[PDB]
Amino acid sequence: TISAADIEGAIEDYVSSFSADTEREEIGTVIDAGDGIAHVEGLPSVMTQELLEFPGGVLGVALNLDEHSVGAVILGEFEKIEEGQQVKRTGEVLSVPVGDAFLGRVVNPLGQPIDGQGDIAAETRRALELQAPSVVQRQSVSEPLQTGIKAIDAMTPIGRGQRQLIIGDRKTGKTAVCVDTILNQREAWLTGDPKQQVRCVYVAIGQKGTTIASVKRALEEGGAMEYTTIVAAPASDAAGFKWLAPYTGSAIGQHWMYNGKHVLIVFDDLSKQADAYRAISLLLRRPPGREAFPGDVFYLHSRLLERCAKLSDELGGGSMTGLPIIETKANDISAFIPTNVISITDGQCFLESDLFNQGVRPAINVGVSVSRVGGAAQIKAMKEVAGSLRLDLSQYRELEAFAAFASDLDAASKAQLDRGARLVELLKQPQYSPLAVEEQVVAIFLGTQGHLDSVPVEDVQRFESELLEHVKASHSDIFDGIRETKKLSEEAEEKLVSVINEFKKGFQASDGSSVV
Amino acid sequence: TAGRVVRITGPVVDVEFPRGSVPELFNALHAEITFGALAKTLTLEVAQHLGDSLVRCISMQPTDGLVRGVEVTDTGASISVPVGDGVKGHVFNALGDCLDDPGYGKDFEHWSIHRKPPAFSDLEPRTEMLETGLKVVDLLTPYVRGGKIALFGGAGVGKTVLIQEMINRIARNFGGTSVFAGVGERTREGNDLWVELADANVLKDTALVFGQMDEPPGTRMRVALSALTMAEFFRDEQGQDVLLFIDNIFRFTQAGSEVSTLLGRMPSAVGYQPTLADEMGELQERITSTRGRSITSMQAVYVPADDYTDPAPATTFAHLDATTELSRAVFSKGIFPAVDPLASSSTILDPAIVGDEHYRVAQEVIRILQRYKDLQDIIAILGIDELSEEDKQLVNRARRIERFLSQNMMAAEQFTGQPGSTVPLKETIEAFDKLTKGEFDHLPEQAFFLIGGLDDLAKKAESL
Amino acid sequence: RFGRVLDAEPRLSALLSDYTTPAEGRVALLDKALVNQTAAALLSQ
Amino acid sequence: XXXXXXXXXXXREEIGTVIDAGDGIAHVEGLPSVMTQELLEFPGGVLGVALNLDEHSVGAVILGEFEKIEEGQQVK
């Protein structure tokens, strides 16, 4: 229950702790304001990128320091600014409060709470512009970040310290894939060891408020809100917030990373940050480069993504993994911002809308997605079982494109075409259904080892879902053997084949037929 | 305390104020034009502070006849518009002055058009389907309560009839009201609409806001925010559902780009304003549902050169949840309300958000209509006698499904005298499930036109 | 003291902003409105 | 009080002069009371439209006989 003692004790603590330092400080005045930027006179002592504050309870970033005046960009409700207002120094370089107290909170880019739930019990502050760890401090990515999407974990494994670009079109499931990845971590978070206990940050830039709320609900319903913090810059706020929202997201992350925690960052979506920086630059009257973007958008997205790494054991074995999302204008992957971010990240999972409308979900374009870290982060069972699948599917796609109008063909083409159709049918799965890796390996074994070669294409997704629940109810030693050793030993593989055959010998086909 | 006009350049006006009295930005200022043929009271909106107490403004009316050094009186608030039940059945300009009867509504409560969207804690955490009671809408392209719907079409495609339909639907089924935002509308079409809604006698429940093309781009930009501020009052204070038409949201984008150029801000990709996505976001995010009440929106959206990559439509189609396209090829068959079942689309149409049976039946009807659409060329060139029997049995169903999407809609009651129908969702998803299975194929096509519900099909079949 | 009067009187201060006007009539107004003799001399300078 | 009395005590049609001309445009100084789009008449019987009104001088576009405009001409 509640008690009066806690409320009285909190007020008495505030009262007793109240004092004023009476500190001497420079006050400036606003001499110009417009459209989310303002010029300040005075402030002889202001640092570059000092966080200013304005009388409306509004902050600003001192970007340009001229001989007579300081050009400050305004963060939040610039409507409340007018000429002749006094401005004062916060005394801090551009920084956010940070700490474990952010887990389970929704905050705006400044590290103010937006959920209305309460104040934030911050541990310390971190400057946004602290340099990424140098070439000597890093280590090789060597550790799996299990996403729970069969399409991804089979062909394009994500390792801790990778940056994996989720480039796609509008309305293709990019947000659904990232929420699925954040949900999948709950099976790890319930263990106490920091080594497995991945914790997550989702930063929303320019999303609809309903879409942010829907993500907050889907993560509450999954239990992910124990360990997720949401930086929200919804489409209604000023360009300065949409510009900071990735940086503050990374700064909340880095405080845990350098402590030797594992962190996941989702940027949703990093094109709308580029558009916000285009706004702020053109209002500053800097000249545009290509596609109206200012010359330095590369130095925006690289300065951001280079923070994500795995540290060396000498610096504490922590790591941060980035999933930047990019939206592609009608699938032109040669556009400016797509190619800039593809040049930074360690690989991409291109999601193609032409497949999504056919019901291939997730719509992973297996022919263009890659992981440039590759099998170094993939558990040896998955590496052995799935490592062929990628090229076999790509050559299935070109073969299907050829054979679509071939009246008859060789038996080797027809067998490959049927295998590839069954493997594409195998890889799809429904939304919010994260599969543990001990099940993903078996689901892909069914395909690659040809145990599906009896089954008609319309039965295959049913068959795979049922068989995983069969092996979950009885013969659990398959999944225990796989998980406890990360390898599919022969003495388990024979028991698996025996369960496969025993299931096929009892399988009623959806067409009313039966097979073996 | 009053200011002086110091510089004039086209629609743009700079004013100087006494040192202590500089107005807050987005305040409305008033200025006089005294010349006999052009006598006006001229409303300025504050855009920027240039230093030296100078304020950059943009005019809501033509600046012709304005003289340097005339007095400017600050109003001390943003542009404000009247709100209340007595707004319904009147026509207003963006500035809240009535066009149907001048000086009407001065006594009403006034609200600032520039106000913030809902707080994060107040948004509804899941989308709810709007059961609008139109067969084609509910089945093929379900609407989202508090969502935004894009509309495509033109003259001779029933578009004004669909507007009168949706207004009647909101007034009768949900006890709400509608607002119509003529964002840069033709003055002829605005008068044709005003007379059409008066003759239908729906105007009694609709508030009209026109920002005519005749006036400078400050007004063609602010009109959408004015209409939205009337709708926000009806949602929050009267506690009604509200349906907000916008025609046409491309002209809101364009007007914004032109104001930005007059203010001398540097233009971005293909020449839009640099604030575009926030300029639009500060409108579209404000249309939503909170505390169990909702502002639904229909938005006509022009696409320049028909490419859905241009920043104007690429920005706009980020916000909206559904897309109704009206087709002249459907209207010319006599199928009303002429919603194209293949080109229209909706994003709520998922097995997680609507029942699995609804999704299955919508996928089957789309498949059948897509097959018929692929056969129509063979039919036109070679005739039905060139078909096999297995596909001709499909076309026999497709003809009937295409007819059965038509409804005796309430807007037609003016002419037909028969009342309009409102089918429940649980009826229409049975009726199309039966109809795709062919149980009604023994009936003629005339038995399905304008029919409404399945029991009505049973009546009309026995009448014929 | 004159600074106090000019800052407290915003309309007089604005009417005193005479660089675009005929300075002679401005100085005549300021001397007729405005003591220490040398202070008023600096003000007229 | 005394300040208001001093201000009230401190408180024929105007002719402007051309300060600039080129390419079909002239800038006319003065004319404190000109209105936007007033017809201006120049001394050679040519006309101008007073289309822009800066802090110092009127920007007037010239209808037709532009060659007859010189700096220091009187504008009625």
UniProtKB/Swiss-Prot annotation, chain C:
F-type ATPases have 2 components, F(1) - the catalytic core - and F(0) - the membrane proton channel. F(1) has five subunits: alpha(3), beta(3), gamma(1), delta(1), epsilon(1). F(0) has three main subunits: a(1), b(2) and c(10-14). The alpha and beta chains form an alternating ring which encloses part of the gamma chain. F(1) is attached to F(0) by a central stalk formed by the gamma and epsilon chains, while a peripheral stalk is formed by the delta and b chains. It comes from the Bacteria. It is found in: Cell membrane. This is ATP synthase subunit b-delta. Binds 2-aminothiazole antibiotics, which are antitubercular agents. It comes from Mycolicibacterium smegmatis (strain ATCC 700084 / mc(2)155). In the N-terminal section; belongs to the ATPase B chain family. F(1)F(0) ATP synthase produces ATP from ADP in the presence of a proton or sodium gradient. F-type ATPases consist of two structural domains, F(1) containing the extramembraneous catalytic core and F(0) containing the membrane proton channel, linked together by a central stalk and a peripheral stalk. During catalysis, ATP synthesis in the catalytic domain of F(1) is coupled via a rotary mechanism of the central stalk subunits to proton translocation.
